[PDB]
Design an enzyme around this catalytic site. Structure first.
Site, PDB file in Angstrom:
ATOM      1  N   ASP A 112       0.793  -1.239   0.000  1.00 14.84           N
ATOM      2  CA  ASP A 112       0.000   0.000   0.000  1.00 14.84           C
ATOM      3  C   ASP A 112       0.825   1.289   0.000  1.00 14.84           C
ATOM      4  O   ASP A 112       1.306   1.792   1.013  1.00 14.84           O
ATOM      5  CB  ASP A 112      -0.923  -0.045   1.210  1.00 14.84           C
ATOM      6  CG  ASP A 112      -1.935   1.071   1.177  1.00 14.84           C
ATOM      7  OD1 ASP A 112      -1.879   1.927   0.272  1.00 14.84           O
ATOM      8  OD2 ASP A 112      -2.784   1.082   2.104  1.00 14.84           O
ATOM      9  N   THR A 113       0.971   1.812  -1.228  1.00 15.63           N
ATOM     10  CA  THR A 113       1.746   3.018  -1.415  1.00 15.63           C
ATOM     11  C   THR A 113       1.106   4.244  -0.767  1.00 15.63           C
ATOM     12  O   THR A 113       1.804   5.227  -0.535  1.00 15.63           O
ATOM     13  CB  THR A 113       1.980   3.301  -2.914  1.00 15.63           C
ATOM     14  OG1 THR A 113       0.712   3.478  -3.566  1.00 15.63           O
ATOM     15  CG2 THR A 113       2.760   2.157  -3.567  1.00 15.63           C
ATOM     16  N   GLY A 114      -0.145   4.229  -0.449  1.00 13.70           N
ATOM     17  CA  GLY A 114      -0.848   5.337   0.198  1.00 13.70           C
ATOM     18  C   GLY A 114      -0.756   5.295   1.711  1.00 13.70           C
ATOM     19  O   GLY A 114      -1.310   6.198   2.356  1.00 13.70           O
TER      20      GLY A 114
HETATM   21  C1  LIG Z   1       0.018   6.394   9.595  1.00 10.55           C
HETATM   22  O1  LIG Z   1       0.171   5.267   8.723  1.00 10.55           O
HETATM   23  C2  LIG Z   1      -1.026   5.005   8.120  1.00 10.55           C
HETATM   24  C3  LIG Z   1      -2.066   5.941   8.152  1.00 10.55           C
HETATM   25  C4  LIG Z   1      -3.257   5.678   7.488  1.00 10.55           C
HETATM   26  C5  LIG Z   1      -3.405   4.495   6.775  1.00 10.55           C
HETATM   27  S1  LIG Z   1      -4.866   4.173   5.851  1.00 10.55           S
HETATM   28  O2  LIG Z   1      -5.187   2.729   5.888  1.00 10.55           O
HETATM   29  O3  LIG Z   1      -5.899   5.107   6.399  1.00 10.55           O
HETATM   30  N1  LIG Z   1      -4.669   4.684   4.319  1.00 10.55           N
HETATM   31  C6  LIG Z   1      -4.179   6.050   4.228  1.00 10.55           C
HETATM   32  C7  LIG Z   1      -4.506   6.618   2.846  1.00 10.55           C
HETATM   33  C8  LIG Z   1      -5.978   6.943   2.705  1.00 10.55           C
HETATM   34  C9  LIG Z   1      -6.049   8.428   3.105  1.00 10.55           C
HETATM   35  C10 LIG Z   1      -4.614   8.905   2.949  1.00 10.55           C
HETATM   36  O4  LIG Z   1      -4.241  10.061   2.984  1.00 10.55           O
HETATM   37  N2  LIG Z   1      -3.796   7.903   2.752  1.00 10.55           N
HETATM   38  C11 LIG Z   1      -4.038   3.786   3.374  1.00 10.55           C
HETATM   39  C12 LIG Z   1      -5.033   3.417   2.279  1.00 10.55           C
HETATM   40  O5  LIG Z   1      -4.433   2.730   1.198  1.00 10.55           O
HETATM   41  C13 LIG Z   1      -6.216   2.611   2.783  1.00 10.55           C
HETATM   42  C14 LIG Z   1      -5.861   1.214   3.298  1.00 10.55           C
HETATM   43  C15 LIG Z   1      -7.118   0.449   3.734  1.00 10.55           C
HETATM   44  C16 LIG Z   1      -7.807   0.830   4.876  1.00 10.55           C
HETATM   45  C17 LIG Z   1      -8.963   0.141   5.272  1.00 10.55           C
HETATM   46  C18 LIG Z   1      -9.435  -0.943   4.530  1.00 10.55           C
HETATM   47  C19 LIG Z   1      -8.796  -1.294   3.351  1.00 10.55           C
HETATM   48  C20 LIG Z   1      -7.596  -0.652   3.034  1.00 10.55           C
HETATM   49  N3  LIG Z   1      -7.228   2.539   1.722  1.00 10.55           N
HETATM   50  C21 LIG Z   1      -8.348   3.246   1.636  1.00 10.55           C
HETATM   51  O6  LIG Z   1      -8.704   4.121   2.447  1.00 10.55           O
HETATM   52  O7  LIG Z   1      -9.109   2.963   0.532  1.00 10.55           O
HETATM   53  C22 LIG Z   1     -10.430   3.538   0.606  1.00 10.55           C
HETATM   54  C23 LIG Z   1     -11.318   2.722   1.560  1.00 10.55           C
HETATM   55  C24 LIG Z   1     -11.897   1.599   0.726  1.00 10.55           C
HETATM   56  C25 LIG Z   1     -11.353   0.202   1.020  1.00 10.55           C
HETATM   57  C26 LIG Z   1     -10.337  -0.079  -0.066  1.00 10.55           C
HETATM   58  O8  LIG Z   1     -10.495   0.923  -1.063  1.00 10.55           O
HETATM   59  C27 LIG Z   1     -11.508   1.858  -0.712  1.00 10.55           C
HETATM   60  C28 LIG Z   1     -11.052   3.304  -0.768  1.00 10.55           C
HETATM   61  C29 LIG Z   1      -2.374   3.578   6.759  1.00 10.55           C
HETATM   62  C30 LIG Z   1      -1.193   3.806   7.446  1.00 10.55           C
END
Ligand SMILES: COc1ccc(S(=O)(=O)N(C[C@H]2CCC(=O)N2)C[C@@H](O)[C@H](Cc2ccccc2)NC(=O)O[C@@H]2C[C@@H]3CCO[C@@H]3C2)cc1
Ligand SMILES: [Cl-]
Ligand SMILES: [Cl-]
Ligand SMILES: [Cl-]
Ligand SMILES: [Cl-]
Ligand SMILES: [Cl-]
Ligand SMILES: [Cl-]
Ligand SMILES: [Cl-]
Ligand SMILES: [Cl-]
Ligand code: NA
EC number: 3.4.23.16
Lengths: 99, 99
Positions: free
Chosen positions: A25-27
């Site tokens: 997860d690059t995000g």
């Molecule tokens: C501090 O380190 C971290 C902080 C936040 C996160 S995160 O999981 O909230 N997220 C951060 C992203 C989203 C906001 C931002 O600025 N960066 C990593 C994401 O890749 C996250 C990772 C993720 C979180 C929860 C469930 C699945 C994946 N995916 C996600 O939010 O995708 C959204 C939700 C929906 C599920 C999958 O795709 C749909 C769109 C991870 C590590």
């Protein structure tokens, strides 16, 4: 390997002696794993995303095996809906995004 | 290009004539952008992130430039802390993850 993104980029990891699946997860700044025990000291942390914040335990200097590549770094453990390998460990295995 | 992950993978996007920064996010199934106006009708959708679920507006067939590549596809608009480019559009611009 090269991974297309038609599907979720899921790989097998080994952490704490346990085999798990996790998202590359690059995000994600940080690596976040679903609730489990890890050895050593930890400190509390709050991390936020869509939906808001969760409380996690921050463990330092944890080794993970990511698709057969060893990495060491900080691992956050808490009520995440998915195991996420974030940039802090992706850099260690030389991962890049290409287009 | 080839993008390493020591920093956030931020790129410039252009949507509705506006320039914005967005995160290339392999962990996101969907593209989710901060509230703005978009043309056409929208439909409801709920997405689940790390802190729980949120309601967003789903707009289909929206034209969006991503780092100089044209994509046309689904954009979700809602209270996200960051504009994120998910796999639905990463595949359109031909992105891959490599290590
Ligand atoms: C501090 O380190 C971290 C902080 C936040 C996160 S995160 O999981 O909230 N997220 C951060 C992203 C989203 C906001 C931002 O600025 N960066 C990593 C994401 O890749 C996250 C990772 C993720 C979180 C929860 C469930 C699945 C994946 N995916 C996600 O939010 O995708 C959204 C939700 C929906 C599920 C999958 O795709 C749909 C769109 C991870 C590590
Ligand atoms: Cl455990
Ligand atoms: Cl955070
Ligand atoms: Cl919590
Ligand atoms: Cl680290
Ligand atoms: Cl490097
Ligand atoms: Cl750019
Ligand atoms: Cl912006
Ligand atoms: Cl909401
Ligand atoms: Na430690």
């Amino acid at each position: 390997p090269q991974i297309t993104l038609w599907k979720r980029p899921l790989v097998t990891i080994k952490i704490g002696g346990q085999l798990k699946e996790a998202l590359l997860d690059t995000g994600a700044d940080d690596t976040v794993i679903e609730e489990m025990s890890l050895p050593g000291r930890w400190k509390p942390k709050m991390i936020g995303g869509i939906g808001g914040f969760i409380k996690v335990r921050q463990y330092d200097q944890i080794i993970i095996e990511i698709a057969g590549h060893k990495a060491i770094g900080t691992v956050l453990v808490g009520p995440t809906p998915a195991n996420i390998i974030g940039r802090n460990l992706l850099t260690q295995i030389g991962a890049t995004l290409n287009f």
